[PDB]
Design a protein around this ligand. Structure first.
Ligand code: HEM
Ligand code: HEM
Ligand SMILES: N=C(Nc1cccc(CNCCc2cccc(F)c2)c1)c1cccs1
Ligand SMILES: N=C(Nc1cccc(CNCCc2cccc(F)c2)c1)c1cccs1
Ligand SMILES: C[C@H](O)[C@H](O)[C@H]1CNc2nc(N)[nH]c(=O)c2N1
Ligand SMILES: C[C@H](O)[C@H](O)[C@H]1CNc2nc(N)[nH]c(=O)c2N1
Ligand SMILES: [Zn+2]
Lengths: 405, 403
């Protein structure tokens, strides 16, 4: 019957059709001959105006003034502005709508039930690296809120004709250093080897711990990036303990409270915000499974398994699975004890299922990347594993962008 | 543009050039990826699939271009032009069956692909004969617990008639009895096949693990019912290495996974009944079959027995119970001397397979969502490996349910 993707939930037996995917203006990486859904990185003039017009149409739809005189006047304002300057500028409320929509549109985010609750800090007046730092500190303070975390984004000035970009060089506001050793191994977080060395190249005096907070390397237009040390009192961390394994605290593990992504581009109506850091709170598997157990990250599975006295000499003891579960439990327990917002992967995926239903009714579908939405432990124990998903690109969007260096 | 494929744990990069050999479309387009969906939405064409397959075969025996090769192409061509169809030689069928397995993107067990016993049952003319062949397949593949991969190929589809079909989705399936109040006793995945069995005259039991009879269908005949001799169905009682109450749950699973509802396509020819068997990867039983909410759904029972706090997700009671259940399956299969592979060993051998296939064919079609196991995903190397999904032929395909 319906000429749209049919989407099945295999746990419940229920069927929906995604009609929203029709509004996709941008190609993904798949073709009829081959699916590239699992790749992490899939490989203006009148063009701007059409993205602009579409965005303005979306704005006026969301305030229910679509076709109105205020709607037609905004369209004319935008084309006039582009006509004379090659670019245009968003009203404050358009920025707020666009940032929330970009989050709503992100297929890889399992946290989207929260999308309507986003504090948008408008930092489009920023004109130096020093001021970026003040804005970032204010963001961190607001978002951290002594452990009661609050979703926020800070938006620095858009890319502009000729002029250099605003960029935060760091991939997150909080990152632990990774120091390449003589033997070729890494102390700290191997994910951060390159940013760490950039920080040293730019004058930072390196420490030598497993959990040294990195400075921020902030770049204002047409200038070299500048180095800023976060005041330690602004970076809330949680030492890790386990509810019943008393030795786990002795491992001296910790993670920071605030996940704040700083290297993504926010695109709204064809305008490009190259510095627009955003933060929410962690889902517990990000820390306990990926950051702590990935082989190319802290890689602590075997140390924990040994402390647990498990048989690490054979795969069939399920030592990796047992250790990972206890590490995840330690993350959840430690964040709870410390009163820092965190969400477990069961609670998060249940809420994402609710989000899917809300969006089916509001927009006729919801772009979702199954490989990313399904948690990295206990996949089929969560309701999302059993849910088919349609992945597609809608704008406004958060997008990857090349590293500034 | 051929895809660049990266492993994120190791930093290594390959290029899939095999995908250019795909003739069949999947469900994705540039506008939207449908990769997570479980199911899909003339003489010249048969002749070109047939030639392509004959070519694959002679290349496989190093005999491309030979007189044997060109004469086989003429035989196939003469047969199609005259009759609209053709027939495979046994050796071609053997090669085709192994290649369809090799090409199966959802299969994590393909390191084994070269090791497949092929039973030719194309001279089968009745449901009765199908049963004899199936019994011999089970006996062979089971081998007192030392499992051996096998396929039995029944007669191909033919334009003028109904298909040979096995109605059951596996040769071994537990009954699912729907209650007056909607709920299910046994395996809810098998409610429909169970009702079909009763309706065709099977006297049902009333347990959680009642082995179903087979419904076997010869062309344009109602299916017939055949009870499997109990000695042919090897089962494993489930116990746990350290948790004594676990055996009290009364759980078991069967040794032999033997899928019997898929269509085998070779060179344009279609085998609507070609059941195949290997051995289980432990998560299929421990995680999916026993812990899926729409299956036996035992997570709560086990958590309670383990005295876990089920009042909150953040105790990870589900995760803890699931791990113990998978451990029980592995332990119990090991104790019974029945072949099984855990999800770490299986995914490690699949990585070796990806590397063998890169060297041999310049790629390997793989469906990431199916290859990564349903617990402990990122703890296995396959999670960090990009994969390219596409359809090569010979292939195993889904087909409609015959009722
Ligand atoms: C409210 C709490 C939130 C939770 C628990 C959450 C959860 C997550 C998780 C677990 C991921 C996967 C990250 C990874 O595996 O590397 C993710 C991806 C993402 N989320 Fe969120 N999210 C939250 C809020 C936000 C906010 C506030 C934004 C932006 C306004 C956001 C936008 C994104 C984007 C853009 C991605 C994709 C990153 C990529 O493609 O690489 N989310 N989310
Ligand atoms: C040797 C031991 C083998 C192991 C451990 C194994 C493992 C698996 C697993 C775990 C799956 C996913 C099944 C599911 O979740 O429903 C699978 C899929 C599959 N395997 Fe195997 N495999 C083996 C041998 C074979 C053999 C002998 C064949 C056929 C000749 C085969 C063909 C397939 C096919 C066609 C699928 C996909 C089914 C679908 O798309 O629904 N495998 N394999
Ligand atoms: N809980 C969070 N997690 C999160 C959200 C978005 C992005 C990320 C970081 N993802 C990095 C993935 C990655 C890593 C290395 C290379 C690569 F291409 C991609 C993490 C939040 C961060 C900000 C708001 S919520
Ligand atoms: N270990 C095995 N497992 C396995 C292999 C292939 C297929 C299957 C069963 N998969 C059925 C998946 C499924 C379930 C419900 C509905 C649906 F559409 C599809 C299981 C083997 C079976 C035969 C050889 S190895
Ligand atoms: C190759 C594969 O796409 C890659 O490992 C993905 C899989 N799923 C993921 N899912 C999330 N949420 N985060 C990730 O980094 C990844 N990594
Ligand atoms: C919707 C989703 O594709 C579906 O639940 C798939 C996911 N991955 C799977 N992987 C395997 N091996 N077997 C399955 O049945 C499934 N089910
Ligand atoms: Zn796809």
């Amino acid at each position: 019957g319906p000429k749209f993707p049919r989407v099945k939930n295999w746990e419940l037996g229920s069927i929906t059709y995604d009609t929203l995917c029709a509004q996709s203006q941008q190609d993904g990486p798949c073709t009829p001959r081959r699916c590239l859904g699992s790749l992490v990185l899939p490989r203006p003039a009148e063009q701007l105006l059409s993205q602009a017009r579409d965005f303005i149409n979306q704005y006026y739809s969301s305030i229910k003034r679509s076709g109105s005189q205020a709607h037609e006047e905004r369209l004319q304002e935008v084309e006039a502005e582009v006509a004379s300057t090659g670019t245009y500028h968003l009203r404050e409320s358009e920025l707020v709508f666009g940032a929330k929509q970009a989050w709503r549109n992100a297929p890889r985010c399992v946290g989207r039930i929260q999308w309507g609750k986003l504090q948008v800090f408008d930092a489009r007046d920023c004109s130096s690296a020093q001021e970026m730092f003040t804005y970032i500190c204010n963001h961190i303070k607001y978002a951290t809120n002594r452990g009661n975390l609050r979703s926020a984004i800070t938006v620095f000035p858009q890319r502009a004709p000729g002029r250099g970009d605003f960029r935060i060089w760091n991939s997150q506001l909080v990152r632990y250093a990774g120091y390449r050793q003589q033997d070729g191994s890494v102390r700290g977080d191997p994910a951060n080897v390159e940013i760490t060395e950039l920080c040293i190249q730019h004058g930072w005096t390196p420490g030598n711990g497993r959990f040294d907070v990195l400075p921020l390397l902030l770049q204002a237009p047409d200038e070299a990036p500048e180095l800023f040390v976060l005041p330690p009192e602004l970076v809330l961390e949680v030492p890790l303990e386990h509810p019943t394994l008393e030795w786990f605290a002795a491992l001296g593990l910790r993670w920071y409270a605030l996940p704040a992504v700083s290297n993504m581009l926010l695109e709204i109506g064809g305008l490009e915000f190259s510095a627009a850091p955003f933060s929410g709170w962690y889902m517990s598997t990000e820390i306990g499974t990926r950051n702590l157990c990935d082989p190319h990250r802290y890689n602590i599975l075997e140390d924990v398994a040994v402390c647990m006295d498990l048989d690490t000499r054979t795969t069939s003891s399920l030592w990796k699975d047992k250790a990972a579960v206890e590490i995840n439990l330690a993350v959840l327990h430690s964040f709870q004890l410390a009163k820092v917002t965190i969400v477990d992967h069961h609670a998060a995926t249940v809420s994402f299922m609710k989000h899917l239903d809300n969006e089916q009714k509001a927009r006729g579908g919801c772009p979702a990347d199954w490989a990313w939405i399904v948690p990295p432990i206990s996949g089929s124990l969560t309701p999302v594993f059993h849910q088919e998903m349609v992945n597609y690109i809608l704008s406004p969007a958060f997008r990857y962008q090349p590293d500034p260096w």
